[PDB]
Short mmCIF file of N, CA and C in Angstrom, two decimals:
data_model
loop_
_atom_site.label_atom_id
_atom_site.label_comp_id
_atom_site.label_asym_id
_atom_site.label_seq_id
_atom_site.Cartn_x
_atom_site.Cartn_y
_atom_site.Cartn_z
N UNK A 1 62.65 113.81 151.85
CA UNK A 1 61.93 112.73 151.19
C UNK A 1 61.54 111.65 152.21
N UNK A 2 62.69 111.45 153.10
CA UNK A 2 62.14 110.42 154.49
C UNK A 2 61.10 111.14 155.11
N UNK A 3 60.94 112.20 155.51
CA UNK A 3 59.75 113.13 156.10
C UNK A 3 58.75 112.73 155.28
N UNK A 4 58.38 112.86 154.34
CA UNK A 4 57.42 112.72 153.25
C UNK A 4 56.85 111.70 153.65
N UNK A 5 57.63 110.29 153.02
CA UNK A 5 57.70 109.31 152.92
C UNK A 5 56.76 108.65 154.70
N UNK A 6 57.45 108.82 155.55
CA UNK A 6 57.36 108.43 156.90
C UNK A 6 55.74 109.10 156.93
N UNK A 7 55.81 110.44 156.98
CA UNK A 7 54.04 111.27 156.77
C UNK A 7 53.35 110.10 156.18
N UNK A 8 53.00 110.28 154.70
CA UNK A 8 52.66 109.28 153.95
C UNK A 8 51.97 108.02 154.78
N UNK A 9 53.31 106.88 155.47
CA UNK A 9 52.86 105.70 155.60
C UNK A 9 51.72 105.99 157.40
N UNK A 10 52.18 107.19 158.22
CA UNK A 10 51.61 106.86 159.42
C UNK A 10 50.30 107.38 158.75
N UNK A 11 49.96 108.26 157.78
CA UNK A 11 48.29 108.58 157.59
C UNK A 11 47.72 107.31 156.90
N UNK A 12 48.28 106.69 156.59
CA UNK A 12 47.49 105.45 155.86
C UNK A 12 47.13 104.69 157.08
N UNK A 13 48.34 104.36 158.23
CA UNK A 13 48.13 103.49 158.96
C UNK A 13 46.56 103.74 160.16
N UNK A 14 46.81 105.35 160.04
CA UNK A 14 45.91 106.29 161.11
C UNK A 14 44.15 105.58 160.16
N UNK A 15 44.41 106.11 158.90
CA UNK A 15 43.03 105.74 158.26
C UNK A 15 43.10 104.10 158.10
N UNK A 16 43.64 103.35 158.65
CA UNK A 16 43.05 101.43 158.83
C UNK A 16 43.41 101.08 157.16
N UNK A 17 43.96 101.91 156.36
CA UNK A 17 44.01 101.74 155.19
C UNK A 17 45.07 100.55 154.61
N UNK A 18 44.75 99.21 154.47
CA UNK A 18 45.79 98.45 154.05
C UNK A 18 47.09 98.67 152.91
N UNK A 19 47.90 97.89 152.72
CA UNK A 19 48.87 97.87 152.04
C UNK A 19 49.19 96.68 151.74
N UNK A 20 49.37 95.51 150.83
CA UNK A 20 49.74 94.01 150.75
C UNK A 20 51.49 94.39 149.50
N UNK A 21 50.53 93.68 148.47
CA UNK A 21 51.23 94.09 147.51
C UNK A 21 50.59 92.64 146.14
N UNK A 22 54.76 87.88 146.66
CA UNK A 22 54.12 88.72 146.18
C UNK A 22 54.49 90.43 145.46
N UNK A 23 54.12 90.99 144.38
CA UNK A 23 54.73 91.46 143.96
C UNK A 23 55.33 91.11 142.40
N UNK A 24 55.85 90.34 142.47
CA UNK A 24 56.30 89.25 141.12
C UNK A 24 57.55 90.18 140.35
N UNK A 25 56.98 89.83 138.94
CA UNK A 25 57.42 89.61 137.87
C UNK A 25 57.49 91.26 137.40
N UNK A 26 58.37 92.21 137.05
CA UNK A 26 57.74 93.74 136.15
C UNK A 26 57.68 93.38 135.22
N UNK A 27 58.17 92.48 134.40
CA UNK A 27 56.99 92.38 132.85
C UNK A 27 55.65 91.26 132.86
N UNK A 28 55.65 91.21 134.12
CA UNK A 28 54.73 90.11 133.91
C UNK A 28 53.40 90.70 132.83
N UNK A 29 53.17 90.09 132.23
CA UNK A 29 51.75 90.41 131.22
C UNK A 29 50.48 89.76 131.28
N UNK A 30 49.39 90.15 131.52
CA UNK A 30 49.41 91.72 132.41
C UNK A 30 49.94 91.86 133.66
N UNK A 31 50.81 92.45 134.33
CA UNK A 31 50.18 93.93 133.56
C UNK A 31 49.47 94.51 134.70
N UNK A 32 49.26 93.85 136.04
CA UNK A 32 47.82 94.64 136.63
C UNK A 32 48.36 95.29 138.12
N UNK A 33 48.56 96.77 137.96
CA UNK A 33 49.16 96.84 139.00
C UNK A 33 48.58 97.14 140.38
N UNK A 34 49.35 96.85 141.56
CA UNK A 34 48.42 96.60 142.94
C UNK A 34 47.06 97.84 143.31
N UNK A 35 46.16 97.43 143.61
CA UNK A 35 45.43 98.65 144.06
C UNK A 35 45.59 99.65 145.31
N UNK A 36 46.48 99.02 146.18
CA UNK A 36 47.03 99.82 146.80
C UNK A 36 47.85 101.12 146.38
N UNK A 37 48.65 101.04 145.11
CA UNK A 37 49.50 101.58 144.60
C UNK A 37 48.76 102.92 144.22
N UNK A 38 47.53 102.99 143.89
CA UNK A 38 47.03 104.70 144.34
C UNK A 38 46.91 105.11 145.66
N UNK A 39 46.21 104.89 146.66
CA UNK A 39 46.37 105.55 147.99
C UNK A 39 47.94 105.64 148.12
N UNK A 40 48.99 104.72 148.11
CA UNK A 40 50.23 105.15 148.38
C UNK A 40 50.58 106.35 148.20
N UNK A 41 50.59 106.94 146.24
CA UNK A 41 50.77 108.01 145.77
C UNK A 41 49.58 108.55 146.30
N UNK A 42 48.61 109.03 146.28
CA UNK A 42 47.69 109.75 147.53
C UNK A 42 48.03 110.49 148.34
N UNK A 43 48.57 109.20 149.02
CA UNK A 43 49.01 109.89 150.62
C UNK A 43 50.08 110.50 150.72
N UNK A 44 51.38 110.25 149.18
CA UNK A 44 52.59 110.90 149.24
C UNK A 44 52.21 112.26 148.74
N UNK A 45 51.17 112.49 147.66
CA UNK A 45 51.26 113.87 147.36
C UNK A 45 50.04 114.92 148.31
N UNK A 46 49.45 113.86 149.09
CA UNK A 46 48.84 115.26 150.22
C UNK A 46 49.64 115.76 151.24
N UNK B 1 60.62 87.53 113.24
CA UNK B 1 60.15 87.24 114.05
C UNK B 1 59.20 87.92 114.77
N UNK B 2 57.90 88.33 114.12
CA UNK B 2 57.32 89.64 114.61
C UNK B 2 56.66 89.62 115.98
N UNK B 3 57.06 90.88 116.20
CA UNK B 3 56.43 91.43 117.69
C UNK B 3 55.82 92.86 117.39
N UNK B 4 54.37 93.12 118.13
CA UNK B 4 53.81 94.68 118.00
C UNK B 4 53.82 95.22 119.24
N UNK B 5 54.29 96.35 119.29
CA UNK B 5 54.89 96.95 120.73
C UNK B 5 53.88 98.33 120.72
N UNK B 6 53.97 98.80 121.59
CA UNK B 6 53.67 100.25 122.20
C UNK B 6 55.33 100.87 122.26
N UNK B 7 55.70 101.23 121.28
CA UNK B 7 57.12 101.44 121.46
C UNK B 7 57.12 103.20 122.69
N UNK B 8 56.45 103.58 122.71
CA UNK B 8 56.50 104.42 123.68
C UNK B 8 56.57 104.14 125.29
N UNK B 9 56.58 102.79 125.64
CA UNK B 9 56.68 102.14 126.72
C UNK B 9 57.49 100.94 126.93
N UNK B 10 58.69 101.79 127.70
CA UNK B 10 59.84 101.38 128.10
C UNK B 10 59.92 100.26 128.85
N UNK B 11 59.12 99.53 129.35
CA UNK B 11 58.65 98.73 129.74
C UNK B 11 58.07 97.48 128.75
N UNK B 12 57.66 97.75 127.86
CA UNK B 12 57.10 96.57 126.85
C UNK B 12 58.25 96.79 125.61
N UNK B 13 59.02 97.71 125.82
CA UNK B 13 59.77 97.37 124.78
C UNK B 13 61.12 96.98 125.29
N UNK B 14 61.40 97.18 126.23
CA UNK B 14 62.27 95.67 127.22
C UNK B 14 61.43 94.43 127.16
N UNK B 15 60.62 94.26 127.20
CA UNK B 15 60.18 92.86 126.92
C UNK B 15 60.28 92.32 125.83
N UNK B 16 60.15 93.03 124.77
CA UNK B 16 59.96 92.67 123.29
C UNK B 16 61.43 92.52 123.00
N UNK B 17 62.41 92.92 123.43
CA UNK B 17 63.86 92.92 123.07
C UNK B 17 64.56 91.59 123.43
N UNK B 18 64.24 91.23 125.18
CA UNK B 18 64.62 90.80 125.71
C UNK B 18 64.34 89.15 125.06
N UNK B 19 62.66 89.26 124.87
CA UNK B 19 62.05 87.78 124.36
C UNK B 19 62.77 87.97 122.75
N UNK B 20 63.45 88.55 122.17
CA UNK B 20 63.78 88.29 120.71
C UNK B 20 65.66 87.98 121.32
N UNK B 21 66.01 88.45 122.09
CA UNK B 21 67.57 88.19 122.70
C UNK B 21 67.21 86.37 122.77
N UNK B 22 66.10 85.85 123.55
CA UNK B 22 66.18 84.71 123.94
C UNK B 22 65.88 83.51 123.04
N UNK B 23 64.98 84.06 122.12
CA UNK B 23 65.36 83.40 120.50
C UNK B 23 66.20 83.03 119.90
N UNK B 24 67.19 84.07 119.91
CA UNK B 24 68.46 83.73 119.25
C UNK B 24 68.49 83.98 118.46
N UNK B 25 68.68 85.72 118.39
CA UNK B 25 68.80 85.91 116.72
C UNK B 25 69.52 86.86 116.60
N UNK B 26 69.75 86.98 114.74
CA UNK B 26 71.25 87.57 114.24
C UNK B 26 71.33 89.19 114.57
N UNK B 27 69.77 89.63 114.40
CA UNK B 27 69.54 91.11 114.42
C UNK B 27 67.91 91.58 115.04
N UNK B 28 67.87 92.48 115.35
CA UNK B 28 66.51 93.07 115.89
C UNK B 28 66.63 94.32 114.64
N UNK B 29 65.42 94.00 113.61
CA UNK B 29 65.11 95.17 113.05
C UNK B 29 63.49 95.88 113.85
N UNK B 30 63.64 97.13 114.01
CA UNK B 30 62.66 97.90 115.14
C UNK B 30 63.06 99.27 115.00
N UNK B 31 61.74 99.74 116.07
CA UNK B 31 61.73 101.25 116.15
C UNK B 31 61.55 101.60 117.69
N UNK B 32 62.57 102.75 117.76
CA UNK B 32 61.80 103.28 119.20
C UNK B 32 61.28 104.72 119.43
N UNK B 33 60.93 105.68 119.83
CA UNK B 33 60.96 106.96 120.27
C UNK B 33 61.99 107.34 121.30
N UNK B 34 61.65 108.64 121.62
CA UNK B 34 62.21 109.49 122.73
C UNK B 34 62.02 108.53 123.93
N UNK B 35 60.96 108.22 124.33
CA UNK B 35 60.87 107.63 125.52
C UNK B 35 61.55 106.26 126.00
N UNK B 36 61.80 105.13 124.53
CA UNK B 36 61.88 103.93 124.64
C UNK B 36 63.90 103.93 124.20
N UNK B 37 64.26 104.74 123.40
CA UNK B 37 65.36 104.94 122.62
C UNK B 37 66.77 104.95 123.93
N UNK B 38 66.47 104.94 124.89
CA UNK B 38 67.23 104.13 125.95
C UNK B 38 67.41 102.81 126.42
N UNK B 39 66.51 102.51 126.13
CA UNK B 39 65.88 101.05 126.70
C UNK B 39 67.04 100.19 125.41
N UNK B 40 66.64 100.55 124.09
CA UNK B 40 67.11 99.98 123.10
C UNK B 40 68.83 100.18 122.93
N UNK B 41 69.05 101.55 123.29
CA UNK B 41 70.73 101.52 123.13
C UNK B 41 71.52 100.42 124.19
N UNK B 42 71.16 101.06 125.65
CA UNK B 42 71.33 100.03 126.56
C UNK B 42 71.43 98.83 126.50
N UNK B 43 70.29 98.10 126.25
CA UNK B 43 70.15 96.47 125.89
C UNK B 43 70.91 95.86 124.66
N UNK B 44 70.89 96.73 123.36
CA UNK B 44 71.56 96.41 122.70
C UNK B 44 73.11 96.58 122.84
N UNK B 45 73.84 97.78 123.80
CA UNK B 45 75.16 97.61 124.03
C UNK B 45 75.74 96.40 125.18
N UNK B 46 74.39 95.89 125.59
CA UNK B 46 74.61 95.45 127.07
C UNK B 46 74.93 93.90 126.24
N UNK B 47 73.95 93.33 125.74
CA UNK B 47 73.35 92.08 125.42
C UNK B 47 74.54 91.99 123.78
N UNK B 48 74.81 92.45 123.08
CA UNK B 48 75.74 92.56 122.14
C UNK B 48 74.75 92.28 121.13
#
């Protein structure tokens, strides 16, 4: 899962692809979650 | 004290529990499913 994981963050870094996120609240309402948070999963399941 | 939930999301129905815990009240009458029906045992054994 660290293999994965580690894969994952250097191809994002390779494609200039940001990451921020801050963060807050999980019930905050809404509700709107980061847009980063797809390329993450992206890059974990290629 | 009504609240309308997505009771299939374990997530809004911790919220809905939590904001009726902070009210102050005698009982939570509600529903959950398969998905949420953790959320509710939990909180309610946790929170009394």
């Amino acid at each position: 899962a660290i293999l994965v994981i580690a894969e994952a963050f250097r191809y994002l870094r390779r494609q200039r692809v940001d990451v921020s996120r801050s963060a807050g609240d999980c019930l905050a309402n809404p509700a709107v979650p980061w847009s980063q948070g797809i390329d993450i999963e992206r890059a974990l399941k290629m | 004290h009504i609240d309308n939930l997505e009771v299939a999301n374990s997530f809004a129905v911790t919220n809905a529990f939590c904001s009726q815990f902070s009210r102050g009240v005698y009982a939570i009458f509600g529903f959950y499913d398969k998905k949420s029906v953790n959320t509710i045992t939990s909180f309610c054994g946790t929170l009394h």
